[PDB]
Design a protein around this ligand. Structure first.
Ligand SMILES: N[C@@H](CCC(=O)N[C@@H](CS)C(=O)NCC(=O)O)C(=O)O
Ligand SMILES: N[C@@H](CCC(=O)N[C@@H](CS)C(=O)NCC(=O)O)C(=O)O
Lengths: 216, 214
């Protein structure tokens, strides 16, 4: 009947997909796992995604899809009304590169399994573990600020004047700066674009703090 | 086409494979990532991330990020397809690729190894536990997915090489380099050997690049 997503309130990866579903007007239901209580490690969920991570997405008949970027492209290829990539190949590649600075080189360094491994494997206290998370955030934010401020492709959004996968990934990082307490004063271009993105109904409705399980 | 690369780099290897498979000539400029060439101002002007690959295609600005580059080559060049036609199949191929390119590889690159040693004072051998765990986690995920999902054929997705296989082999060759036991991943091994048997892949292999050991 309708698209079904396995997600979590806090997850940046689920947030990216949630935004795309809203932007494209796709009706969906979301099942919220508790990733801190280990719902992602239960046999029932491992049957859906052996990786033990969210998001996982069902689109009618067929196996579930995982990995937020792959899912964003799937939605692009199967629901074309509101495109979230430009048409020109260099512009597409830049948007994807910016997206991947976040989705490959930043976010995977601060997910719960990394945070717990640092504590459990090395005996690091949470406070010292967070130095790794902060370094990942700051490294990604500095990269994005430099690229967005200096490259000709930036407009109202990351790439030109249309929302793209880059912006979905950027806002997913930005909301994390709030959640994890990263100072963002040094990234004014990232701030400008993130606030432009967050002003959209489709994005705001998808915000982690509006999902079940969120704190006040 | 001009690529800033490195002999050992898994991400550069992904792109190098695609260039060879598609019949795209390239110049590769080999950075020394132990010497910190990637942190030099001239290179940071090319890629503020201080990472490889970075690719120039004619006169435009450089392109970074191996997956973004793979899609760029798909979209702007002819040569053998490395993605299927049907969206569910494309999504699966990309998801398997991203298990490696997003969730595994970024955890074992030099910058992370260095941060672990310098920030926490971890001995090299203790730091390597982080690298080993990342490999094993990714290999376990790939073995389970590839062994149980109907989409797997001769290759990761069906019977044609795709982005999934380029990322998979980029991880596989790391198992030898970092001494990861692979006995538990026979499906990954089977596919990796099918992939390595392709001359284009074999030519691109890290251990066959200038800068690699004798
Ligand atoms: N690269 C993956 C990220 C998958 C991932 O690790 N997601 C996190 C939440 S944002 C997760 O569910 N982690 C579970 C865990 O660490 O145990 C994607 O884009 O979907
Ligand atoms: N997600 C990026 C990864 C880029 C990356 O981390 N490259 C490594 C080599 S495989 C690098 O240059 N690292 C520099 C460093 O760690 O200092 C991609 O797919 O291109």
């Amino acid at each position: 009947s309708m698209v079904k997503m396995y997600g979590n309130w806090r997850s940046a990866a689920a947030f990216r997909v949630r935004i795309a579903l809203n932007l494209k007007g796709i009706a969906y239901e979301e099942v919220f796992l508790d990733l801190d209580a280990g719902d992602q490690h239960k046999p029932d969920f491992l049957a859906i995604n052996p990786q033990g991570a969210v998001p996982a997405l069902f689109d009618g008949d067929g196996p579930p899809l995982t990995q937020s970027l792959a899912i964003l492209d799937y939605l692009e290829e199967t629901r074309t009304g509101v495109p979230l990539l430009p048409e020109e190949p260099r512009a597409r590649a830049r948007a994807r590169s910016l997206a991947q600075v976040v989705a490959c080189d930043t976010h995977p360094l601060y997910v719960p399994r990394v945070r717990t491994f640092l504590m459990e494997n090395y005996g690091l206290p949470r406070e010292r573990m967070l130095e790794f998370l902060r370094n990942a955030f700051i490294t990604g934010l500095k990269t994005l600020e430099t690229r967005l401020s200096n490259e000709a492709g930036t407009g109202r959004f990351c790439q030109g004047d249309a929302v793209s996968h880059a912006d979905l990934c950027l806002i997913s990082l930005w909301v994390g700066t709030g959640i994890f307490g990263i100072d963002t004063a040094a990234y004014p271009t990232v701030k400008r674009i993130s606030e432009e993105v967050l002003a959209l109904d489709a994005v705001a409705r998808a915000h982690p703090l509006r999902q079940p399980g969120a704190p006040a």
